[PDB]
């Protein structure tokens, strides 16, 4: 019974809408534009992870460092608790030493 | 629930079809059917 008895409504995808059609444009902004701009400057997203990557602990540390003062109170409390938990887990748990 | 299993019906039926000629709940309930089907095989 864990199965739907009707076909789901058809999902139509426009492969040639503007977003898909122009996807990838300016990814070579650096090597084709005399390196005035780095391609990572094209990234739109959270201010604390534009052109940067890390595990959950590093992401949380960076978020606290960069926008911690602007965070809501309980969100910041949750982030502090999460950093503490992730520190304990990554530095004290695991199969490997 | 990013990724959920949608085939569980067919996965269950693959065993229940071999269990259909058993006695009692072994022919209906997958938990009991799978044990008796393995023994049968």
């Amino acid at each position: 019974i864990g199965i739907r008895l009707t076909l789901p409504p058809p999902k139509v995808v426009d492969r040639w809408n503007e977003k898909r059609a122009m996807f990838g444009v300016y990814d070579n902004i650096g090597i084709l534009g005399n390196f005035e701009k780095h391609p990572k400057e094209l990234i739109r997203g959270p201010i604390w992870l534009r052109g940067w990557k890390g595990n959950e602990l590093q992401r949380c540390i960076r978020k606290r460092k960069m926008v911690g003062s602007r965070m809501f109170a309980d969100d910041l409390h949750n982030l502090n608790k999460r950093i503490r938990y992730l520190y304990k887990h990554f530095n004290r748990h695991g199969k490997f030493r | 629930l990013r990724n959920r299993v949608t085939d569980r019906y067919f996965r269950i039926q693959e065993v229940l079809k071999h269990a259909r000629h058993f006695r009692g709940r072994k022919n209906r309930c997958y938990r009991l059917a799978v044990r008796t089907v393995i023994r049968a095989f």
């Binding site: 739907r4 008895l5 076909l7 789901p8 999902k11 | 949608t6 019906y9």
Partner: peptide, 26 residues
């Protein structure tokens, strides 16, 4: 509801097979 189409289509195919077995066309 679970997202996806393949399981639903498989179930429709099995329903069609069972329907053909129960009431085969003349």
């Amino acid at each position: 509801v679970k997202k996806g189409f393949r399981a639903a289509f498989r179930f429709q195919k099995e329903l069609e097979r069972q329907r053909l077995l129960r009431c085969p066309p003349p």
